[PDB]
Amino acid sequence: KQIPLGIYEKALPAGECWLERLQLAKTLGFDFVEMSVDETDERLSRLDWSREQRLALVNAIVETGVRVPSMCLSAHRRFPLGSEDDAVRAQGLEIMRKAIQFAQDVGIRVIQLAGYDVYYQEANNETRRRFRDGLKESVEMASRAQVTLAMEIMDYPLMNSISKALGYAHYLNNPWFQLYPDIGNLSAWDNDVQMELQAGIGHIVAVHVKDTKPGVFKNVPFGEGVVDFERCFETLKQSGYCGPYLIEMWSETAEDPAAEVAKARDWVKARMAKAGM
Amino acid sequence: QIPLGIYEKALPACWLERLQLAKTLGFDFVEMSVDETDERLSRLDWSREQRLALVNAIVETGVRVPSMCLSAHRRFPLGSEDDAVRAQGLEIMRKAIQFAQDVGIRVIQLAGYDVYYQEANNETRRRFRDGLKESVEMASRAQVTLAMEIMDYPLMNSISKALGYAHYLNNPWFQLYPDIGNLSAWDNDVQMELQAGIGHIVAVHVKDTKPFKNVPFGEGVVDFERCFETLKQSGYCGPYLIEMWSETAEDPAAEVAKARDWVKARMAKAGMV
DSSP assignment of chain B: ---EEEEGGGS---HHHHHHHHHHTT-SEEEEE--SSHHHHGGGG--HHHHHHHHHHHHHH--B--EEEEGGGGTS-TT-SSHHHHHHHHHHHHHHHHHHHHHT--EEEEP--S-SSS---HHHHHHHHHHHHHHHHHHHHHT-EEEEEP-SSGGG-SHHHHHHHHHHH--TTEEEE-BHHHHHSSS--HHHHHHHTTTTB--EEE-B-----SBPTTSSS--HHHHHHHHHHHT--S-EEE---GGGSSSHHHHHHHHHHHHHHHHHHTT--
C-beta neighbour count of B11 within 10 angstroms:
21
- Closest partner residue to A146 (CB to CB) among B66, B140, B172 is B66
- Closest partner residue to B59 (CB to CB) among A4, A51, A146 is A51
Q: HSE-up of B28 (CA within 13 Å, CB side)?
A: 16
Q: How far is A204 from chain B (nearest CA, A)?
A: 7
Q: What CA–CA distance (Å, rounded) separates A203 from A175?
A: 9
Q: Do B142 and A175 touch (CB under 8 A)?
A: no
Q: How far is B256 from chain A (nearest CA, A)?
A: 22
Chain B residue with the nearest C-alpha to that of A104: B104
Q: Do B55 and A58 touch (CB under 8 A)?
A: yes
Q: Residue A101 burial (CB < 10 Å; 0-12/13-18/19+)? A: middle
Chain A residue with the nearest C-alpha to that of B108: A146
Interface of A to B at Cβ within 8 Å reads 2, 4, 51, 54-55, 58-59, 62-63, 67, 69-70, 104-107, 109-110, 140, 143-148, 173-176, 178-179, 201-206, 240-244
Pick left, alpha or beta for residue A94 (phi over 0 → left; psi -120 to 50 → alpha; otherwise beta).
alpha
Q: How far is B166 from chain A (nearest CA, A)?
A: 10
Q: Do A4 and B141 touch (CB under 8 A)?
A: yes
Chain B residue numbers with beta carbons less than 8 Å from the beta carbon of A203 are 172
Chain A to chain B Cβ contacts (< 8 Å): 103
C-alpha distances (whole Å) from A32 to each of A69, A237, B106 are 7, 20, 18
For domain A1-277, give the fold: TIM Barrel (3.20.20)
Q: How far is A173 from chain B (nearest CA, A)?
A: 5
Q: What CA–CA distance (Å, rounded) separates A61 from A209?
A: 23
Q: What CA–CA distance (Å, rounded) separates B110 from B78?
A: 11
| 3-class DSSP state of A120 | coil
Q: What CA–CA distance (Å, rounded) separates A165 from A159?
A: 6
Q: How far is B28 from chain A (nearest CA, A)?
A: 10
- Closest partner residue to B104 (CB to CB) among A70, A107, A241 is A107
Chain B residue numbers with beta carbons less than 8 Å from the beta carbon of A2 are 141
Chain A residue numbers with beta carbons less than 8 Å from the beta carbon of B63 are none
DSSP A23-90: HHHHHTT-SEEEEE--SSHHHHGGGG--HHHHHHHHHHHHHH--B--EEEEGGGGTS-TT-SSHHHHH
For domain B1-273, give the fold: TIM Barrel (3.20.20)
Q: What are the residue boundaries of the structural domains of chain A, listed by start?
A: 1-277
Q: Residue A39 burial (CB < 10 Å; 0-12/13-18/19+)? A: middle
Chain A residue with the nearest C-alpha to that of B203: A146
Q: Residue A255 burial (CB < 10 Å; 0-12/13-18/19+)? A: exposed
- Closest partner residue to A178 (CB to CB) among B3, B59, B172 is B172
C-beta neighbour count of B28 within 10 angstroms:
20
- Closest partner residue to A242 (CB to CB) among B56, B137, B237 is B137
Structure-solving method: X-ray
Q: What CA–CA distance (Å, rounded) separates B236 from A144?
A: 10
Opening angle at CA A131, ends A202 and A204, nearest 5: 15
- Closest partner residue to A58 (CB to CB) among B52, B67, B172 is B52
Per DSSP bridges, beta strands B174-177 and B145-149 are parallel
Q: What CA–CA distance (Å, rounded) separates B268 from B259?
A: 14
Q: B153 Cβ partners below 8 Å, 6+ apart?
A: B112, B113, B116
Q: A11 Cβ partners below 8 Å, 6+ apart?
A: A247, A248, A249, A250, A251, A252, A257, A260, A261, A264
Q: How far is A241 from chain B (nearest CA, A)?
A: 8
Q: Do A205 and B55 touch (CB under 8 A)?
A: no
- What's this structure's resolution in Å? 2.1
C-beta neighbour count of A131 within 10 angstroms:
25
Beta bridge partners of B205: B179, B241
- Closest partner residue to B107 (CB to CB) among A140, A144, A146 is A146
Please provide residue B7's backbone torsions phi and psi, each rounded to the nearest 5 degrees.
-65, 145
Q: Do B170 and A243 touch (CB under 8 A)?
A: no
| 3-class DSSP state of A128 | helix
Q: Do B145 and A146 touch (CB under 8 A)?
A: yes
C-beta neighbour count of A240 within 10 angstroms:
16
